[PDB]
């Protein structure tokens, strides 16, 4: 809205209460919108007997299509916005402005790939709270979207040439961060919950679990092609993202479930570990949806006025 002349402001995308606010809002959105037939949540406080909370409820088959949310200043506060395209998300920003509201953000719940989001305006950007810590998630922001077309018939398609181009740019940014002499390797998820190990998302109100091995199986700066086809599974028994628990939904009713999304970013983790080897391994990650919100909110902060 209006630029602040000669003003330097510190941003920290990893400690941003806008992220926490958005998170609670999406959890509430899902309560009123995507209701399971049965949901289970653990309760073990007595230290001698557990009592799982079980809720059974009406379970309507409904279309689910995320629409943009705009966050405007909460009472007593103001929203500041960092204008530097390449801003890492943590540190001083010299080009800051005040805005009435954020840009429109679609609250897509997904793992591994970030979908239907904003693209970087210059080069590919990577962000972490601590790059040296192998346990911390790396948020990648692409500067060019990649289409992924999915069907309820059990697969997602991605153009192989575009994906390769994308991987090359990511690896080049990763070696820029971890060493120019490093070989960059992408591998499949090392394990965990199904929602974590596959690229997991919802389409037509159904939960898709697609095998992403073919997307993360290459080596960079070391020395059926046209389309990559990922096998998918639609499931009814789902681990909850909102909190520890499980939900069960009814089977699909539509024989024509079709979605096409733009991949605009990804979530990766680095293997790390003690090694004199001159290579780094990166695997798809995600699961904490706050990282999804961060990927869009990194350039904003709210300040007391």
């Amino acid at each position, epitope marked *: 809205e209006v630029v602040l002349v000669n003003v330097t402001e510190n941003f920290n995308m990893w400690k941003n209460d806008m992220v926490e606010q958005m998170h609670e809002d999406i959890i509430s959105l899902w309560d009123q919108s995507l209701k399971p037939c049965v949901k289970l949540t653990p309760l073990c406080v007595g230290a001698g007997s557990c009592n799982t909370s079980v809720i059974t409820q009406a379970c309507p088959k409904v279309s689910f299509e995320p629409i943009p949310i705009h966050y405007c200043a909460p009472a007593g506060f103001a929203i500041l916005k960092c204008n530097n395209c390449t801003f890492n998300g943590t540190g001083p920003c010299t080009n800051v402005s005040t805005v009435q509201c954020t840009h429109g953000i679609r609250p897509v719940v997904s793992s591994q790939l970030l979908l239907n989001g904003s693209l970087a305006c210059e080069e590919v950007v990577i962000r972490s709270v601590n790059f040296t810590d192998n346990a911390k998630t790396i948020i990648v922001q692409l500067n060019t979207s990649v289409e992924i077309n999915c069907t309820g018939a059990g697969h997602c398609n991605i153009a192989r040439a575009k994906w390769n181009n994308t991987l090359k740019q990511i690896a080049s940014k990763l070696r820029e961060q971890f060493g120019n002499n490093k070989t960059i390797i992408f591998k499949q998820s090392s394990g965990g919950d199904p929602e974590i190990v596959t690229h997991w998302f919802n389409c037509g109100g159904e939960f898709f679990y697609c095998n992403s091995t073919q997307l993360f199986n290459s080596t960079w700066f070391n020395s059926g092609s046209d389309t990559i086809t990922l096998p998918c599974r639609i499931k009814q028994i789902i681990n909850m993202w909102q909190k520890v628990g499980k939900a*069960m939904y009814a089977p699909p009713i539509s024989g024509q479930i079709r979605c096409s999304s733009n991949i605009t970013g990804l979530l990766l983790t680095r293997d790390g570990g003690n090694s004199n080897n001159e290579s780094e391994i990166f695997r798809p990650g995600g699961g904490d949806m706050r990282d999804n919100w961060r990927s869009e909110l990194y350039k904003y902060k709210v300040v007391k006025i």
Partner: antibody
Amino acid sequence: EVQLVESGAEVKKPGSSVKVSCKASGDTFIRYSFTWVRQAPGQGLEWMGRIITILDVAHYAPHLQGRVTITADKSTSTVYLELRNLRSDDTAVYFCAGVYEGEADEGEYDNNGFLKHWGQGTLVTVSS
Amino acid sequence: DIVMTQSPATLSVSPGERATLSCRASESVSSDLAWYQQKPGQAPRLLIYGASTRATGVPARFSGSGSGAEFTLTISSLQSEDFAVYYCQQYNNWPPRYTFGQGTRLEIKR
């Protein structure tokens, strides 16, 4: 396909409780849901309740809520029905039944309400 | 609760002829409707589920029809082993409160 073998006949006084069992063999236990259906002498079938085995969650007929419990023991592939505060009108043959639900261990679940496999029935007589 | 009504209570059919059984629901149950056969002293046997799908091991002379609130079981040519009691079962509701019809007894007309 599962084979369902039920426990033997029971004779109870009114006010007592009973616990009948049903051993499922031949297929993967957690891929099935199990239902209990009763039939009083000369009468029709009455749905009692059904357990979603993988979730360990059971639902019951309204007229029975409170005094019926359905459980499953995954380690022994056995399904149990308990009926408390027995009345003479609880006299019936009690049937355990089940149906395949899909690859439940892989999150697939059709939630089928029909009943493909049936036990041989257990007579429970409730009388003074 | 959903009430299932079968008619007639007893059906008398001459060997080798066609039998038609009816099941009505007190409200729509879509296609969540099953048919069972029961002989004296034995457990019920599933014949049809989803209103019209034949269960494994069920011969083709058994066919189910209908949707919503009215359903039919047709047996195209009665064999000796087809004489029994037939039950319909509603399983449409959630939370589940499944219900049975009171049965139709199919007996031999002589």
